[model samples]
Target chain A: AGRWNLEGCTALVTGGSRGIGYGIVEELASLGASVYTCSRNQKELNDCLTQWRSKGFKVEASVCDLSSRSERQELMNTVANHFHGKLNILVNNAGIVIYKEAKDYTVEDYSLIMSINFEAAYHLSVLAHPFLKASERGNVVFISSVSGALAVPYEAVYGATKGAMDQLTRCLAFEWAKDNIRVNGVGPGVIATSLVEMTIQDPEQKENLNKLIDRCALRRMGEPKELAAMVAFLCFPAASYVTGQIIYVDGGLMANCGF
Target chain B: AGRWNLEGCTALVTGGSRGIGYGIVEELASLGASVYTCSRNQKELNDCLTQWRSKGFKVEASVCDLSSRSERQELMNTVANHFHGKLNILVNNAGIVIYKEAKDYTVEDYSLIMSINFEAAYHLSVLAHPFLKASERGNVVFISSVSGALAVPYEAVYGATKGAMDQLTRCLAFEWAKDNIRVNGVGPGVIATSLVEMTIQDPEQKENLNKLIDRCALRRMGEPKELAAMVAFLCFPAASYVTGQIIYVDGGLMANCGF
Candidate 1:
């Protein structure tokens, strides 16, 4: 295989039917990985699968709720069976966000956000361990957020979950090294995704979205493909020695500050 | 006052009796700030206060357990009264670490680590807010860990708390911008502090400590004063617009990765 090629590889990307996950699924499948993806909405997932098959990409999908532990377990089992107990890459990309002041955060709010954003990623990585160990080029990438590394007001719980995920990425990178699994992550800053677009389309929410972009050094939302490109690189041998790092595709959001 | 001078500023640094906190207190005072510091150990705090007073630095000390909410409140109340309700800088530099595998972490482990590393910083910042707002130049600096940003194998709970602190830094930067309080942090890599020196002196623990240094690009432990330089800069007018950023003084530890 070429430096970035992934012929005969098997990969799974959670929440791959839309947004950043969709971008990642497309990029990985295009690079010759037999990809498996999941989404809570059947129609969206089906639509993505149909588009990929038409484009002649090796990809499949399943419907599941990531917040439910049983569904996540079932999804991984299906992936293991389909890939014949060998998986090359697992991208823990499924996450949700809630915005509120720190004091206004409820226990329910904490659980719902943490269960999906942090716990689901941890559970999926544990499930993927065996399959990852079986592969010669095992890799795991977490689609983390800049909020995890930098604080964003009103996203206390969401940022904490991302923070936990970032830490987990590092911990696992060291723990699973004996198994030859390389774990890394990407922190996307102000990416222009459907989720973000939907927010921008809302009159009440557009102001906040604009404010975030204004604070960013680039002053523009990054394309999902830009982030997908980095995600795909970490799965290849080119990044062999680079593990336990979260590369931020942030358009300089972390460097700029507004007084 | 000059650009970086703290002529009229009043500051507070937690755990200032030793290690990185001691370095910060000295730097801030040398720049002409009247600094108030605390430690759990009365004798240590007393020794530090005596030394600083001898040097003619406007510095004082108190003894309190950071993990106790009442003590933290009392500490801040004392600071407010001493500074006459006008505090310029608050350094949430006090924290502790417990090393263990994630599977072996206990509820007590989680609470102990989180209470001091994350909650105390949050409480101290809240207490300092009114005083900070009253000052012309207000700043909050969290002496966080690179482990929070990059994962170290046995530091799951400690890293999580730092991650929380990092997120809190960002949230508070934006929320308190209207109050003119700049919130930022520094993530120190392995430093040659007494805590680390003691670890190196232990025969059983020396190997792991050396392993970390080997992975860093500089291949050396950073001095506490090196980190203190950056921390002091963040509190100056030169960094007036620079808020909500965690500058890692890691000797390139985050950049280099060994397979």
Candidate 2:
């Protein structure tokens, strides 16, 4: 197997308390990257890392509301100091899906969704450039969503943010190709995360989600393990030729409507 | 835009010319069904269709080479007659490659790859549109090369064909989605086939192919059967939600360049 050769390297995965972000951290840790993660809840971040560290992975955590640009910089600065300014990989995995109807978004809801899904990813990559440029194989992976590539009914703000990130992935990739800093994005279809579990607890939402699953070729929500493999693939030395592309991990959902 | 209704729908694969196309014809027929196919060579398609048809599969072949406009007309009638005026799936797998320094190709050289690889697929789809639109589930698939989606040297005009097909797939996917006809492409990387055998006979080309395989995560050439699986998946009832997508079955070649 080819190694990423990151025995003493560092990586940062946002929203790593659970779901796809946490999945990426586990893969990075197995390959010997010092995995730094952040979440809105201090308790969960601390609680998650404490358990993982006991298993001998170089794990660390921070409590930061990633929607704010200042907080994003704050976390990056901490990451720089902790790893002596060496950031080999950056996974912009923090994102949220706003459930309101497309036209009914309140100003606050729109602002939070955009900043949480887009600005934090943008600002973090800009701030991490110097450290990434210094590393042997620097890569960035943004956790995007299928909603960004398709038209979904109740996720206007979320889809808009992910779509913007897809473009950002392309533009930054071209800009950094000469520097060997590969950037790519992953768009996952409905994963079995706490957010999704909560959403489906309502009978009406469950019916709609059941229809969503029925439409997928696999006919079920994807596991975090599947999404993690795609994110990890991009960060490897093997993916050196892979840049500026947004791949969907949807279990053939995009090609088959299951009619 | 339409239903696969696989149990009864008829499919046409251009260039049953062997390799991927031949593999698809086999799969579509294996479910106790029929596939309409073509190749420039009479003996080959005749032998293939005849052999397979005797195995209790409804397989039909035509010696009507698609390169000539008149022959394409012949194919339209041949398809209408056998399928009884309805075509459910169209797989554009017929293609030709002329390798030279990008700027050194002759006028005829450029047109040949364009027509065989691009025009045949285009005209066939246009001819099949009416039959396809009438189906509850009609779909189109293109067997494109990884070069279409990536920049590889030594096959400039050939790459142009795949790239053109890709854009066409996207454009038509959007245009015909209203009529329930879905369009997609499968970009393959270094599949072992007849043309590949000749390409590998040259040591330099062999080296490049070995390099291509080394760069892929799977570290091997894909079999024709693998590419067939993707084409078959798209034409099933389970794939109803899939549209406007070009998925790669490249053994992680694009995402992970191992070398």
Candidate 3:
């Protein structure tokens, strides 16, 4: 409660229907922020909104494809109208990954991934700047990945996009400091999410997945809530002095590279 | 030269008279790169050059105050002349720090720290761009600090500057990709350097220093050579895919936040 309380705050979290984005939405709502989330799947958005409302959390949702710049602009217009031009937290958590050999990557693949993963986030942050600057506790949380810093195989483009996001996090933090907007990021390791589970479900990949888990000093995959907790902490007043930083909740995977 | 060799290549390392910068200069030279380093102190740089030359390393030294843009330009000219307009590696390792409570920080303090730590790095990178692009193996390494990612007390300005450096590392990596230049960074945690030792020598700060060391998962401070090894590796062919990354040689300090 005390310094962690988010009462009377308003937040917009991208891609909040499932996975890490869903965790962020839930965490912020639980902390007492009125959260507005979006997803490309209307059914998924409706399901999440129903569950959240039933739990007495102030939640709203919309179906908007972030890959389209116009759609993203429309989504922000709707959010700005709902929030009445006052917003505190902006979480750019929506991202997509296409795992394939670098040589096999096509132009369409690059365009789609870059548009959704980087372009959308950049556009949304700029659009939300006015509302964020209007608030006393304007905060931007980027849900980045360890792939941005680690050279993961078959994730060249994805990692590059995250790298771009990570860089933007730093530049925007300092650039917007005078506006009182603190930009920070959360870099999660292999979390036990549906995406990760499906990625490692192949029998041939089990050994590689096991090795990945072994690489963590904690020797296990992190729960989405752990990352959500850190994100929430950063949005709170406790991290008032924290800006232009990306806190990695990887359970020491990035630490000990010695195999 | 093999995968790790720097034979026939040229490098410029700033602040190479002491500590981590000195280590990088030595490592790069040992890898067979003809290196030119600069420092603000002529005598100190002269001592370094003599010692390195005695060891049969192709090392040269110059006196340049990186805080001055004009001097930085001049330093590049000297480096360019020595390398005949071609450079393979550029290491932005020079930095300065001032530890003071946020309220106690002076305007001059902020300007000086930001000038050397961030402005100098940014300027030098730009000046070295053409030279780097001319070479087949173009690499830029920014020697950042753990404070850039972690909120360390009394290091507000210093940390912010490093945070800027870290961000630039990512942006330049992708932006300069077309130039075939790889940009990366090394964030070192409490290394055994003269600067660190002097900072921690205060009797009252020893307790805090111990706690800092205890925070590392490896349970020890790192050596400059260890960080230098990673920097050298990043510039080698083995890390061809490793760009836009800041390899933290912190002995797992940034990985584990749990006490």
Candidate 4:
């Protein structure tokens, strides 16, 4: 339907069981890439794979938790073994957030957020380095958050991890560009994810969220598909000259600092 | 002088032997801060301190290399101990860049750039965490660069380290906010620095540099003092609500894409 084509490419997306991850998995599969996805929950992974298969798309699922270093290495190795070292793209989308006031944050909470959001991305990129380098045009995408750049209240640690991911993307891009690897990050703001839903459950908080929504240039939360389109675009050859960028798909939430 | 006061503040700047770092040292001293600066070269550090002393500004100098982890720890410990744990501001301004084509970059080059630009900042922050937390209000300012975000050609490794520094600022800001420590980064566009002079010496490269200058919204290279002014503002009490931000004092470089 468009100029950007991904025919014969193989893409691995973490956290692809649902939400934004699922959206990216489906989009990439439709764009002619062999898609492999992973999540911690086997049941959810099976269900998501079934739905995609029902649509006549080939989707592979693995019950691998990204938070564990060994599991992340295993996931990369498994994908490489299955694809015969032809993996062309990696999407580090698996992340978890433990939101709370800065003063109330516990050490355990901080560690968990850092491990899942920042360390997992780091390990995945490191593990995929050789395969990505082998591809003539390889791409690595880190799904960051707007909170990574702008510190919103009550999500400090989560924001920090995302912020770190953004930097990691740049570092890897610089170090690996000689090998023809391109690395970039996407920061999505206030998407209609389960995380956002949980944050604005109370009536007062929901009203505040709406007020925040009014400040965005689009005045609305982003749909999962919108972000998926951006990820797909970054992986395509059209972005040949672009690397080490944290493109924010936030409906211009950052452009206007209303809050 | 107009609003952001540095009167009676004890501020420490790294890599203050000459060039942009020295420029910041002079500006901070003029603002009534007790500016203590360090450089690896003893002769240059002595010369800089003498010049500032001649100007009758409160300035001091020390010889230290930030590339070594032990050296960075010692420097931070000395600074913290000398200030009696009363340091008000810490600027992670020491950075080194080796400009080369991506494929030509060596592992030594990558390690040197990342060590001074990123690892040093990380170590210093960890060392100053207690002292900064004890201050009535403390500021951690990072001097980053446009190359970090813009993906300028032939500056891949330097750009990556700067990008890491930018992200490090956000993460530190989020982690230390409850301790009354504000961490922010300043991204300067092309400026008249020694490093730039060396790289763009060729007539054609100079013309290419001018193309970037023309692309800037301000249509000129920024002065070192201009960047110093922005960093000073972030360090002062007026920016209490501001943290985890990378303000581009780059004459709208990031905002313009017309070229």
DockQ of each: 0.37, 0.02, 0.04, 0.13
Tens-digit lDDT track of model 2 for B1-259: 2244356778888877588888888887775446889887888877886778778778788887777767987898888788887788899898877766433556488557756886677677777888888765688998887777555546644765665566557656766787789888899998888988888888888887888888888889998888988988888877978887878888889897435
Query: Can you write out model 1's per-residue Cα lDDT over B1-259, one digit (the tens) per residue?
Result: 4687878789999998988999999999899899999988999988998888888899988899999988998998999999999999999999887767764666588667777988788778887888999986799999888888766767866787788788878788888888898999899999888778777776656788888889888889988789999998888888887987888998888888662
Better of 1 and 3 by TM-score: 1
Root-mean-square deviation per candidate: 5.5, 14.1, 10.6, 5.7
Best by TM-score: 1
TM-score of each: 0.72, 0.51, 0.56, 0.71
TM-score-sorted candidate list, best first: 1, 4, 3, 2
Top candidate (lDDT): 1
User: In candidate 1, what are the lDDT values of residues A42-109, reduced to their tens digit?
Assistant: 99988898999999999989999999979998999999999999999999999877777764656587
Residue A214 of model 3, lDDT score? 95
| Model 2 collision count | 22
Docking class of 1: acceptable
Query: If both were scored by DockQ, which would come out higher, candidate 1 or candidate 2?
Result: 1
Clash count for each candidate, listed in order shown? 1, 22, 0, 0
> In model 4, how large is the Cα lDDT of residue A229?
96
Q: Which scores better on lDDT, 2 or 3?
A: 3
Better of 2 and 4 by TM-score: 4
Candidates 1 and 3 compared by lDDT, better number: 1
Model 1 ranges with Cα > 4 A deviation: A1-10, A22-85, A100-115, A118-123, A146-175, A189-194, A201-259, B1-8, B26-85, B100-115, B119-123, B146-175, B201-205, B208-259
Which candidate has the top score in DockQ?
1
